[PDB]
Amino acid sequence: ANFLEHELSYIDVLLDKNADQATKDNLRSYFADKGLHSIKDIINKAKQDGFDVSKYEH
Amino acid sequence: ANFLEHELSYIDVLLDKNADQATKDNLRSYFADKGLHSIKDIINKAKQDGFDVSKYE
Amino acid sequence: VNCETSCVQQPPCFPLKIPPNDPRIKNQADCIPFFRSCPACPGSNITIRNQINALTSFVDASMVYGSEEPLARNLRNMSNQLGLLAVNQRFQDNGRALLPFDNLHDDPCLLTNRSARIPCFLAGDTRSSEMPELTSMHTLLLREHNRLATELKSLNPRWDGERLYQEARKIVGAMVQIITYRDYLPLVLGPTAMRKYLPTYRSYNDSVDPRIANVFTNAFRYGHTLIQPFMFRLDNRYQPMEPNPRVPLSRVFFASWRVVLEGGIDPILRGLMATPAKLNRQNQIAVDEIRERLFEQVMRIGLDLPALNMQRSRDHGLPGYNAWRRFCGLPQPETVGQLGTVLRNLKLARKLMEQYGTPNNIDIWMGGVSEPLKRKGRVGPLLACIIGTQFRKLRDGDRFWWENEGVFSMQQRQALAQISLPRIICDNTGITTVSKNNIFMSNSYPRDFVNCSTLPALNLASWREA
Amino acid sequence: VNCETSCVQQPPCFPLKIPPNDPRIKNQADCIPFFRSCPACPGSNITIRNQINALTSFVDASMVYGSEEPLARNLRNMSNQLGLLAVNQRFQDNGRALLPFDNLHDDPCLLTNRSARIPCFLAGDTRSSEMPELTSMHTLLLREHNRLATELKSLNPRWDGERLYQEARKIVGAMVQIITYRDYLPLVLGPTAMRKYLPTYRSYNDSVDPRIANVFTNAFRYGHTLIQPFMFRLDNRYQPMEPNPRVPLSRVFFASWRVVLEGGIDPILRGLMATPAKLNRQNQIAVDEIRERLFEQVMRIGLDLPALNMQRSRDHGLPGYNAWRRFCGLPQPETVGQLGTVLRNLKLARKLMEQYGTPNNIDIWMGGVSEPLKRKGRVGPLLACIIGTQFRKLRDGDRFWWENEGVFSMQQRQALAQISLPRIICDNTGITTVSKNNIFMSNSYPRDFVNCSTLPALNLASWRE
Amino acid sequence: CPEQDKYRTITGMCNNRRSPTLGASNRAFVRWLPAEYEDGFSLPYGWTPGVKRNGFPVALARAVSNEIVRFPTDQLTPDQERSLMFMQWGQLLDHDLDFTPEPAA
Amino acid sequence: CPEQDKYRTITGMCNNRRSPTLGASNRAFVRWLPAEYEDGFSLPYGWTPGVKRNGFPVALARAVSNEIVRFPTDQLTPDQERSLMFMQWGQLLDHDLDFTPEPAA
Ligand SMILES: *[C@@H]1O[C@H](CO[C@@H]2O[C@@H](C)[C@@H](O)[C@@H](O)[C@@H]2O)[C@@H](O[C@@H]2O[C@H](CO)[C@@H](O[C@@H]3O[C@H](CO[C@H]4O[C@H](CO)[C@@H](O)[C@H](O)[C@@H]4O)[C@@H](O)[C@H](O)[C@@H]3O)[C@H](O)[C@H]2NC(C)=O)[C@H](O)[C@H]1NC(C)=O
Ligand SMILES: *[C@@H]1O[C@H](CO[C@@H]2O[C@@H](C)[C@@H](O)[C@@H](O)[C@@H]2O)[C@@H](O[C@@H]2O[C@H](CO)[C@@H](O[C@@H]3O[C@H](CO[C@H]4O[C@H](CO)[C@@H](O)[C@H](O)[C@@H]4O)[C@@H](O)[C@H](O)[C@@H]3O)[C@H](O)[C@H]2NC(C)=O)[C@H](O)[C@H]1NC(C)=O
Ligand code: HEM
Ligand code: HEM
Ligand SMILES: *[C@@H]1O[C@H](CO)[C@@H](O[C@@H]2O[C@H](CO)[C@@H](O)[C@H](O)[C@H]2NC(C)=O)[C@H](O)[C@H]1NC(C)=O
Ligand SMILES: *[C@@H]1O[C@H](CO)[C@@H](O)[C@H](O)[C@H]1NC(C)=O
Ligand SMILES: *[C@@H]1O[C@H](CO)[C@@H](O)[C@H](O)[C@H]1NC(C)=O
Ligand SMILES: *[C@@H]1O[C@H](CO)[C@@H](O)[C@H](O)[C@H]1NC(C)=O
Ligand SMILES: [Br-]
Ligand SMILES: [Br-]
Ligand SMILES: [Br-]
Ligand SMILES: [Br-]
Ligand SMILES: [Br-]
Ligand SMILES: [Br-]
Ligand SMILES: [Br-]
Ligand SMILES: [Br-]
Ligand SMILES: [Br-]
Ligand SMILES: [Br-]
Ligand SMILES: [Br-]
Ligand SMILES: [Br-]
Ligand SMILES: [Br-]
Ligand SMILES: [Br-]
Ligand SMILES: [Br-]
Ligand SMILES: [Br-]
Ligand SMILES: [Br-]
Ligand SMILES: [Br-]
Ligand SMILES: [Br-]
Ligand SMILES: [Br-]
Ligand SMILES: [Br-]
Ligand SMILES: [Br-]
Ligand SMILES: [Br-]
Ligand SMILES: [Br-]
Ligand SMILES: [Br-]
Ligand SMILES: [Br-]
Ligand SMILES: [Br-]
Ligand SMILES: [Br-]
Ligand SMILES: [Br-]
Ligand SMILES: [Br-]
Ligand SMILES: [Br-]
Ligand SMILES: [Br-]
Ligand SMILES: [Br-]
Ligand SMILES: [Br-]
Ligand SMILES: [Br-]
Ligand SMILES: [Br-]
Ligand SMILES: [Br-]
Ligand SMILES: [Br-]
Ligand SMILES: [Br-]
Ligand SMILES: [Br-]
Ligand SMILES: [Br-]
Ligand SMILES: [Br-]
Ligand SMILES: [Br-]
Ligand SMILES: [Br-]
Ligand SMILES: [Br-]
Ligand SMILES: [Br-]
Ligand SMILES: [Ca+2]
Ligand SMILES: [Ca+2]
């Protein structure tokens, strides 16, 4: 259930401005298979589990 | 847990004033092991479990 | 859902559905009731479901003495120090003991003859009242216990009740063992399998697992093929007795009143000795009294015992026929033709394949009882392997086996070798004429009968303690 | 209640008590911590208690891929259809992949070298960080999965990531099977036991029960007697690699930082290839690095791995030595003289009797490792029987065994026969010189070593669609 | 388990000193083969409509009984060499060996 | 359990079609011998002070380790014919086969 460090790579590919559409849908369905339906619930799970994800926020 | 028909005969031995004391205490011990510590408890159990006990008045 | 009245399939109910064009149950929305056997670990999804044995595996006469300490105590007469089993306090059988009555919350015996108001009997096992023939045997052993204890008291007056009870029990247990392994099992298995699976006893082996195998509870139901559709009762000339000498089995289940009010255990015992068993044949497996009318007097519908056996095997997760064949080191037929060769009966093979599709899936009881019988036995190779293996474990894995050194003295062992079931009948009933030779084979009066006077009693002189 | 910090015997704690005159633990009120294994049927007074296996019994490389569905997804790289296993996103060893990091509650790997802040690794099995030598082997197999999937991707452009992942996985599983049965088990059992317990493979048998026996979890810990007290690292001339060439084992447990920051896996693999194992001898059973100081950097007290082995066997309700001897068809010594003969060592037999009273009561691990070793094997007859019986069941009762009709084609099987562990090291590390002949016997540089280019690669031409 | 004893326990406990539940009452049967359930671990073959066994439909137990077991009862063959006591000793003996409990309604 | 497949399941379910949990994860070990517990069914030998095993006191595991296993590390004998890779593959292999869970602190 804990967020893993390598899944921080999968937030970069979702935020990539010209990454393939069928790739970015797979990662959303991956994270939605573990209860995380938005990107804002992907950074809020990485937060609680000990990482820094305000390196996207303002 | 149910009182058994053959146990009624133990009630007879316990109310027999001329039965060996050893015999009786053995039967009281048998009944105490089932949670019945006096004769009035033994008769009552027999009653609850369907037997006529009216010859014990 | 209550499994006895509902046909809804919900745990713990696993009702048998009814096929189209059933010869008896025309109502296809009805069902034959069936409660799944209690799981050893309720509600788990780590464990593989297994069932429970409520009795001791050992051949220890636990069907007389009970297998739990509260029950064992209740079966004993606690009003003196004679070491006796409790007897019925309202009825006798020509001056001899009957079993005491149980006090059940839902008592089926009382539903067989309503006016007679005779409940089921209390014994070491809860099924003692299921047929009067079985009741009669439980009653015989009760009496034999009390006789040994009486005789031991006479021999050793200083012995207390606990001593007399245990020593009598130890003899009864030895007697059940001897009759089982000397007289019974050889006629079940036949000589070849007897030698293979039960070689001469050496000594107790503490590495032999004595548990009952799950599969044995199903395979030992082979006996259902031996059941005759009537209870036979014979008078003291071995002639049919009274007005009801041949009662259909569907009117004797739980009919404890027949023992109490229709003439005691003597006529029943004569009936067992002087009537043939049913032969199992591939085309005559089981009689409609158990297949159509099992327990019909005490419940909403008649059960089907063969069908129960196969439903039960599935309940217990038992592997099919080919798997058991393989476990026994017997060839595993794949085709109808191969099954035909194994059964020496292509017709039956075709019938089994029309039902099951592959011999891999034939239920163990059905496949076991379908096999041709071994020479001078009454099971085929598969059931001979399972039954033989089980009884080998019960013998060799039993620290109190009657021939294990230190259990009995040499003198006691020699005394015990003289016991027979015919003699036990003479000593505890009004019967003066009994089966000769092997009681299990002797079956025709007068050809196979002798006077009780020609048989030696069990001599208890080596049980003398100063 | 807390078995780690308390010495109270209350479930689920079964702490090891301390004898008088212990050479290390002077205070008898203390204990060695121990959790009883989880029961299959918790709280029951009908079942006989049994323990759980959380992994697949099959030799299926589940230590790479995981034994549970959620974990298995987590291990995969889901950012492309290349069918790869996720790799570490922060660190590399000289350009090559390291295992991704796990995210545990009480990360023991963080408590070795606190300043480095290198957490434990995530793999198919939870023990991947336990010693860096184990980690290296894990990292090797991860890389070999990625190499294969890459090569297959090239050879079959059509294939989706599922297909690439499964085919690579199936190859990796077959390599673990081949290394294990062709190269490893013969050197464990010796030729005689090998022929008796592993006769040449025939075909899959669906009546063979492939479960791990309870006793095997204890018996296969024979390998604790092979453990050397140091971790050795060697440079690219197979010389001691500075400045920590020989690290005491009690400073490598959970030391994930050593892989990441003290030179990756290459030095460690070279040290496993070019150092001898410890020999099991009757008066040199097991070293004090595991017997006195097991996990001492990450816990209140150093554990005793041999003693834990024995406590565990009792926890699992395992019969003792003579019962296992009998199971195996071996004679059962009853006296000290007879036990002496069986062990070729009356001195050891007296010391076993002084403790146990009867050989009936000797704990299976202690008994097994005490026995003299089979000719050209590293276990005695008791352990050879248990170990050999188990591996036969894993082979004959595995539907996906690599030689089983229909798993691989004849051409694929022929290609697969060419594989070997040294080749896998060539293919996935910066090492160019590797152990020859049998990697498990070869142990001495340079006489036992060859250039990589002398070793044939695995040819995947028979995987072409 | 006491070290000397002289009689059997009622429950069968302590018959086997090293494994004292073996053959005692209210214990799981030993399995000589691994079990075969529809779902692998619990549900019996025939439970779920449509689920096959090893390639084939599960036959209704009552259908097997109707088609294989049933015969005209007046055609019964007596066993020349066994008495009915042979049947009855078998049932008695079974009742010494095993009872598989069921939940009560 | 599907009637045609192509690759292993992750959990091991369905490797054996007739008994599909066999060799799968999160299942009980099989027993080759009956278990031997202090009380027959649960408590390990060594649990209750004073309770012997088969006639003799239970030896403390640490006490056995001290007397039998302990040796002077300077005596360590290298194996001329086995690499350390031989030890390590065995642990790697063990981790493919069995892991026995325990409760967590
Ligand atoms: C497929 O594999 C099964 C199982 O094989 C075992 O494991 C493999 C890996 C090899 O080691 C085999 O040698 C092993 O046997 C084979 O089935 C077994 O066949 C043997 C020989 O026919 C069977 O053994 C027989 O068992 C009879 C019954 O008693 C046994 O069980 C009781 C109760 O536990 C026990 O007390 C007794 O000691 C026996 O163990 C016995 O009457 C007879 O003499 C003989 O010992 C064995 O039971 C079979 N097992 C199973 C699971 O069916 C297949 O033969 C094999 N097929 C092929 C083609 O290879
Ligand atoms: C006391 O009794 C035990 C048990 O005997 C069994 O049951 C009795 C009633 C008889 O039927 C016996 O014939 C039965 O064997 C005896 O111990 C057994 O000894 C045999 C032969 O030495 C052992 O069999 C060996 O088993 C080896 C290990 O694999 C076996 O177990 C696995 C279990 O999964 C199975 O896969 C495999 O097929 C084997 O069954 C095997 O390598 C070897 O070749 C051989 O088959 C058996 O394991 C013992 N059982 C135990 C210890 O429970 C004693 O010998 C007997 N003593 C005396 C003096 O009579
Ligand atoms: C004399 C008449 C017999 C019966 C009447 C009778 C009935 C049953 C029933 C109802 C069961 C339970 C069926 C179910 O699965 O729901 C049953 C089980 C067993 N039998 Fe039957 N049986 C009679 C006779 C015999 C004979 C002659 C047997 C053997 C020689 C025999 C065996 C068994 C066994 C072993 C069982 C299983 C017991 C258990 O609960 O483990 N029976 N029988
Ligand atoms: C660096 C090498 C090794 C260890 C460090 C190590 C440690 C352990 C520990 C702590 C246990 C558990 C002890 C307990 O019961 O609490 C353990 C168990 C097992 N081992 Fe050990 N081990 C190292 C090395 C090896 C080698 C070389 C082995 C075999 C060749 C080996 C085997 C095993 C096995 C099978 C177990 C039991 C696993 C299970 O949970 O089922 N180990 N090891
Ligand atoms: C039910 O039980 C009663 C016993 O209470 C049976 O009645 C006896 O029948 C015999 C004839 O066979 C008479 O000689 C007795 O005098 C009867 N006694 C009583 C109390 O009436 C009755 O026959 C039984 N019913 C069936 C169907 O057998
Ligand atoms: C106990 O034994 C005596 C003497 O045989 C007998 O009269 C009495 O009825 C018995 N009691 C029971 C309950 O069996
Ligand atoms: C996935 O693979 C790509 C390409 O090989 C790589 O750049 C990326 O880091 C990988 N992600 C993970 C988590 O392995
Ligand atoms: C701890 O780790 C750091 C890594 O940056 C290293 O410099 C240091 O030497 C390590 N300490 C020891 C004692 O090995
Ligand atoms: Br990472
Ligand atoms: Br249920
Ligand atoms: Br109807
Ligand atoms: Br009498
Ligand atoms: Br009564
Ligand atoms: Br009637
Ligand atoms: Br019944
Ligand atoms: Br006594
Ligand atoms: Br005998
Ligand atoms: Br014979
Ligand atoms: Br035979
Ligand atoms: Br056995
Ligand atoms: Br009639
Ligand atoms: Br016929
Ligand atoms: Br026919
Ligand atoms: Br009703
Ligand atoms: Br099969
Ligand atoms: Br055949
Ligand atoms: Br045959
Ligand atoms: Br005959
Ligand atoms: Br007569
Ligand atoms: Br005679
Ligand atoms: Br006779
Ligand atoms: Br616990
Ligand atoms: Br790489
Ligand atoms: Br450090
Ligand atoms: Br570990
Ligand atoms: Br695919
Ligand atoms: Br191989
Ligand atoms: Br070899
Ligand atoms: Br097997
Ligand atoms: Br020594
Ligand atoms: Br032993
Ligand atoms: Br010996
Ligand atoms: Br030897
Ligand atoms: Br040699
Ligand atoms: Br060698
Ligand atoms: Br060997
Ligand atoms: Br190099
Ligand atoms: Br090699
Ligand atoms: Br079974
Ligand atoms: Br099972
Ligand atoms: Br018909
Ligand atoms: Br085991
Ligand atoms: Br067990
Ligand atoms: Br020392
Ligand atoms: Ca019994
Ligand atoms: Ca595995």
- The structural domains of chain D, ordered by start, are 1-465 (1.10.640.10)
Cα gap D30→D15, rounded to integer Å: 9
Cα gap E60→C19, rounded to integer Å: 7
Strands F27-28 and E78-83: unpaired
Tokens of D48: 């006989």
**Ligand 8 closest atom vs CA D244:** 14
Q: Within 10 A of D239 (CB to CB), how many other CB atoms are there?
A: 12
Nearest CA owner, ligand 7 atom 1: D77
Q: Within 10 A of B48 (CB to CB), how many other CB atoms are there?
A: 11
CA distance D209 to chain F (A): 7
List all chains that touch chain C, counting a touch as 3 or more CB pairs closer than 8 Å.
B, D, E, F
Cα gap D203→D295, rounded to integer Å: 43
C441 lines ligand 5 (CB under 6 A): no
A4 closest CB neighbour out of D79, D87, D122: D122
Nearest CA owner, ligand 1 atom 31: E32
Question: What are the residues facing C225 on neighbouring strands?
Answer: none
Q: What is the DSSP letter of A24?
A: H
Q: How far is CA D375 from CA B46, C109, D222, D422, in A?
A: 76, 71, 16, 26
Q: Is C56 annotated as a binding residue?
A: yes
How far is C-alpha C223 from the chain's CA centre?
Answer: 8
**Ligand 4 closest atom vs CA D220:** 35
Q: What is the 3-state secondary structure (H, E, C) of chain C?
A: CCCCCCCCCCCCECCEECCCCCCCCCCCCCEECCECCCCCCCCCCCCCCCCEECCCCCCCCHHHHCCCHHHHHHCECCCCCCCCECCCCCCCECCECCCCECCCCCCCHHHCCHHHCCCCECCCCCCCCCCHHHHHHHHHHHHHHHHHHHHHHHHCCCCCHHHHHHHHHHHHHHHHHHHHHHHHHHHHHCHHHHHHHCCCCCCCCCCCCCCCECCHHHHHHHHHHHCCCEEECECCCCCECCCCCEEEHHHCCCCHHHHHHCCCCHHHHHHHHCCEEECCECCECCCHHHHCCECCCCCCCCECHHHHHHHHHHHCCCCCHHHHHHHCCCCCCCCHHHHHHHHCCHHHHHHHHHHHCCCCCCCHHHHHHHCCCCCCCCCCHHHHHHHHHHHHHHHHCCCCCCCCECCECHHHHHHHCCCCHHHHHHHHCCCCEEECCCCCCCCCCCCCEEEHHHCCCCCCHHHCCC
Q: What is the DSSP letter of F68?
A: I
Helical (H) or strand (E) element with A40: helix A40-48
Locus of tokens 């214990």: E27
Q: What is the DSSP letter of F8?
A: -
Cα gap C364→C328, rounded to integer Å: 13
Task: State the amino acid at position E69 in one-letter form.
Answer: V
Does F contact B via 3+ CB–CB distances below 8 Å?
A: no
Contact with chain D for residue E26, Cβ under 8 A: yes
Cα gap D38→D43, rounded to integer Å: 11
Cβ contacts of D22 on chain F, cutoff 8 Å: 62, 66
C223, E90 Cβ separation under 8 angstroms: yes
Of all ligands present, the nearest one to the C-alpha of C209 is 20
Strands C230-232 and C246-248: antiparallel
Cα gap D402→D419, rounded to integer Å: 13
D38 closest CB neighbour out of F23, F31, F102: F102
Cis bond leading into D132, ω under 30°? no
Locus of tokens 């194994």: C342
Of all ligands present, the nearest one to the C-alpha of D221 is 4
Cα gap F14→F22, rounded to integer Å: 8
**Ligand 6 closest atom vs CA C86:** 14
Tell me which residues of chain F, numbers 44 to 63, contact chain D at a CB-CB cutoff of 8 Å: 44-47, 53-63
Locus of tokens 């220890």: C60
Tokens of F57: 């006191």
Cα gap C382→C393, rounded to integer Å: 17
D51, F28 Cβ separation under 8 angstroms: yes
How far is C-alpha C91 from the chain's CA centre?
Answer: 26
Q: What is the 3-state secondary structure (H, E, C) of chain D?
A: CCCCCCCCCCCCECCECCCCCCCCCCCCCCCECCECCCECCCCCCCCCCCEEECCCCCCCCHHHHCCCHHHHHHCECCCCCCCCECCCCCCCECCECCCCECCCCCCHHHHCCCCCCCCCECCCCCCCCCCHHHHHHHHHHHHHHHHHHHHHHHHCCCCCHHHHHHHHHHHHHHHHHHHHHHHHHHHHHCHHHHHHHCCCCCCCCCCCCCCCEHHHHHHHHHHHHHCCCEEECECCCCCECCCCCEEEHHHCCCCCHHHHHCCCCHHHHHHHHCCEEECCECCECCCHHHHCCECHHHCCCCECHHHHHHHHHHHCCCCCHHHHHHHHCCCCCCCHHHHHHHHCCHHHHHHHHHHHCCHHHCCHHHHHHHCCCCCCCCCCHHHHHHHHHHHHHHHHCCCCCCCCECCECHHHHHHHHCCCHHHHHHHHCCCCEEECCCCCCCCCCCCCEEEHHHCCCCCCHHHCC
Of all ligands present, the nearest one to the C-alpha of D40 is 32
Closest by CA position to C385, among listed C393, C210, C360:
C393
Helical (H) or strand (E) element with F28: strand F27-28
C461, C176 Cβ separation under 8 angstroms: no
* φ, ψ of residue C413 in degrees (nearest 5): -60, -40
Method of determination is: X-ray
Beta carbons within 8 Å of C381's beta carbon, 6+ residues apart: C193, C328, C330, C371, C374
E22 closest CB neighbour out of F13, F22, F34: F34
Nearest CA owner, ligand 8 atom 11: D113
Hey, which residues of E are catalytic here? 95
- What does the buried/exposed string (b/e) look like for C176-197 if buried means 16 or more CB atoms within 10 Å of the residue's CB? bbbbbbebbbbbbbbeebbeeb
Domain ranges of chain F: 1-104
Does E contact C via 3+ CB–CB distances below 8 Å?
A: yes
Tell which one of B3, B9, B23 to mutate to probe ligand 6, the residue whose CB is within 8 A of the most ligand atoms.
B9
Q: Do F1 and E40 touch (CB under 8 A)?
A: yes
F-interface mutation test, from C44, C45, C48, most F Cβ less than 10 A away: C48
Q: Radius of gyration over alpha carbons of chain D, in Å?
A: 23
Helix axes C132-155, E84-97, angle to 10 degrees: 70
A49, D103 Cβ separation under 8 angstroms: yes
Hey, which residues of F are catalytic here? 95
Distance (angstroms) between ligand 13 centre and the Cα of C122 equals: 8
Tell which one of C79, C89, C122 to mutate to probe ligand 6, the residue whose CB is within 8 A of the most ligand atoms.
C79
Burial group, residue D174, by CB count within 10 angstroms (0-12, 13-18, 19+)? buried
Query: Which SS3 state, helix, strand or coil, does residue A53 take?
Result: coil
Of all ligands present, the nearest one to the C-alpha of C321 is 25
D48 closest CB neighbour out of E18, E21, E26: E21
Q: Do E40 and F20 touch (CB under 8 A)?
A: yes
* φ, ψ of residue F62 in degrees (nearest 5): -65, -35
F-interface mutation test, from E9, E11, E18, most F Cβ less than 10 A away: E18
Beta-carbon contacts below 8 Å between D and F: 386
Cβ contacts of D2 on chain F, cutoff 8 Å: 105
How far is C-alpha D301 from the chain's CA centre?
Answer: 24
Q: Within 10 A of D320 (CB to CB), how many other CB atoms are there?
A: 24
CA atoms in the 13 A half-sphere facing the CB of C183: 28
List all chains that touch chain D, counting a touch as 3 or more CB pairs closer than 8 Å.
A, C, E, F
D-interface mutation test, from E18, E30, E54, most D Cβ less than 10 A away: E18
Does D contact B via 3+ CB–CB distances below 8 Å?
A: no
Cβ contacts of C41 on chain D, cutoff 8 Å: 40-41, 44, 46-47
Q: Do C104 and B2 touch (CB under 8 A)?
A: yes
Q: Do A2 and D103 touch (CB under 8 A)?
A: yes
Q: Within 10 A of D246 (CB to CB), how many other CB atoms are there?
A: 14
Q: Say what the resolution is, in angstroms.
A: 2.2
Burial group, residue C27, by CB count within 10 angstroms (0-12, 13-18, 19+)? exposed
Chain breaks in chain B (C to N over 2.5 A) after: none
CA distance E29 to chain D (A): 10
Nearest CA owner, ligand 5 atom 6: C116
Work out the widest C-alpha separation in chain B, in whole angstroms.
30
Residue of B nearest to C81 (CA): B23
Tokens of C230: 């009537």
Q: What are the residues of chain A with a beta carbon less than 8 Å away from any beta carbon of chain D?
A: 2-6, 8-10, 13, 23, 26-27, 30, 33-34, 49-50
Q: Within 10 A of F74 (CB to CB), how many other CB atoms are there?
A: 5
Cβ contacts of F3 on chain E, cutoff 8 Å: 52, 55
Got the DSSP string for chain E? Answer: --SS--S--SS-TTSSSSSTTTT-SSEEPBPSS----TTSSSPPTTSSTT--BTTBPPPPHHHHIIIII---GGG--EEEEEEHHHHHHHHHHHHHH--------
Cα gap C156→C164, rounded to integer Å: 9
- What does the buried/exposed string (b/e) look like for C372-384 if buried means 16 or more CB atoms within 10 Å of the residue's CB? bbbeebbbbbbbb
Closest by CA position to D63, among listed D120, D124, D121, D122:
D124
Query: Which SS3 state, helix, strand or coil, does residue A13 take?
Result: helix
Q: What is the DSSP letter of F80?
A: E
- What does the buried/exposed string (b/e) look like for D102-118 if buried means 16 or more CB atoms within 10 Å of the residue's CB? bbeeebbbbebbeebeb
Cα gap D61→D173, rounded to integer Å: 5
Beta-carbon contacts below 8 Å between C and E: 383
Tokens of D359: 């050989």
Beta carbons within 8 Å of D217's beta carbon, 6+ residues apart: D51, D53, D312, D316, F29, F98, F100
**Ligand 4 closest atom vs CA D216:** 35
Helical (H) or strand (E) element with F87: helix F84-97
